[PDB]
Amino acid sequence: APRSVDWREKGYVTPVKNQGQCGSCWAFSATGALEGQMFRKTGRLISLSEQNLVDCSGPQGNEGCNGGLMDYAFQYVQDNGGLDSEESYPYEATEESCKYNPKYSVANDAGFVDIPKQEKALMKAVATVGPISVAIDAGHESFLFYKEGIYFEPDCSSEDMDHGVLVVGYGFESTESDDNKYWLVKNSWGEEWGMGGYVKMAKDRRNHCGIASAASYPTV
Amino acid sequence: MIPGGLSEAKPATPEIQEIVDKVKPQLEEKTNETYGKLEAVQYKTQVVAGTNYYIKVRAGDNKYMHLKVFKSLPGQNEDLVLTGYQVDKNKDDELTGF
């Protein structure tokens, strides 16, 4: 595959979405990973329901608009036996009652795989599996203002992550400082933020922002 | 900390008090009451598509409230919006998301 990977080119990724004011990044990261795994297994791209996750995955440990984990969402899809499409279960940006309807389930999983905490293992998973769910430290002012180039925040934490996003690929670009490698990351803050809603995060700089600390993907 | 979770509580800083002062006009409009000085005491933050601040404030007659304040992304000029609040809180009540 190397030296660059961008799953968007092969049709594995839906357009950028927007979580709004709800702490539901975890649900967007999970549907992003499921969308890519379902594409791999069916050849069809269908946008999945974050709201279904926000409303129904509390039993698995998620906290609606107050946070959650992508693994818990994968556990929910396994336990529930399905997840509704985005069209059938739209996003409201607030936690509501569970209204899952099996008639509109368009995806499913059997569980999930946690990637070892190494950027090398993460690279192998992105190249060989597809888009991967990851948690990152996005709590700095530099991240709010990100617009171009490779993001690097010296104060980034490798262990305390507060946001869930989706790695769709990786690559390189010549740079003034020779820190040239990045992870291609799909965010859920709308298309206007960042580079069309994406951020190139520093790659191979000691697990910058913890990108490799809590990476996983659903088993379909 | 989980993705989208609230941070741990920290004492209010002058920057948090400034955010409270800036949104007071919105609070008075929604509650239809005036508050005089709302003093920020403690706060949590939460990353969303932007940032939410959960701020415990002390009001008159020693009443407390928890304010939720959304700081918009740069594309929306970082506009501060009071998106929710909880009234009749106690001094020691935990700041929890809502």
From Swiss-Prot, chain A:
Q: Which residues participate in Zn(2+) 6 binding?
A: D160
Top-level lineage group: Eukaryota
Q: Where, by residue number, does Zn(2+) 7 bind?
A: D162
Q: Which residues bind Zn(2+) 2?
A: E50, E86
Q: Kindly list the positions annotated as binding Zn(2+) 1.
A: E9
Q: Report the active site residues.
A: C25, H163, N187
Residues at which Zn(2+) 3 binds:
D71, D114
**Residues annotated to bind Zn(2+) 4:** E92, E96
Annotated glycan sites: N108
Q: Which residues form a coiled coil?
A: none
For the ligand (Zn(2+) 5), the binding residues are: D137, H140
Q: Which segments are removed on maturation as propeptide?
A: 176-178
Q: List the disulfide bonds.
A: C22-C65, C56-C98, C156-C209
Protein known as: Cathepsin L
Question: What is the species listed in this Swiss-Prot or TrEMBL entry?
Answer: Homo sapiens
UniProtKB/Swiss-Prot annotation, chain B:
Alphabetized GO MF terms? cysteine-type endopeptidase inhibitor activity; protease binding
Q: Which UniProt keywords apply?
A: Acetylation, Cell adhesion, Cytoplasm, Ichthyosis, Protease inhibitor, Thiol protease inhibitor
Q: Does the keyword Cytoplasm apply?
A: yes
The organism named in the record is Homo sapiens (Human)
Q: Where is this motif: Secondary area of contact?
A: 46-50
* Name this polypeptide is given: Cystatin-A
The tissues where this chain's protein is expressed are given as: Expressed in the skin throughout the epidermis.
Hey, which family's this protein in? Belongs to the cystatin family.
GO CC annotations, alphabetized: cornified envelope; cytoplasm; cytosol; extracellular space; nucleoplasm; peptidase inhibitor complex
Q: Name one GO biological process term.
A: peptide cross-linking
What job does the chain carry out? This is an intracellular thiol proteinase inhibitor. Has an important role in desmosome-mediated cell-cell adhesion in the lower levels of the epidermis.
Please tell me where this protein is predominantly located: cytoplasm
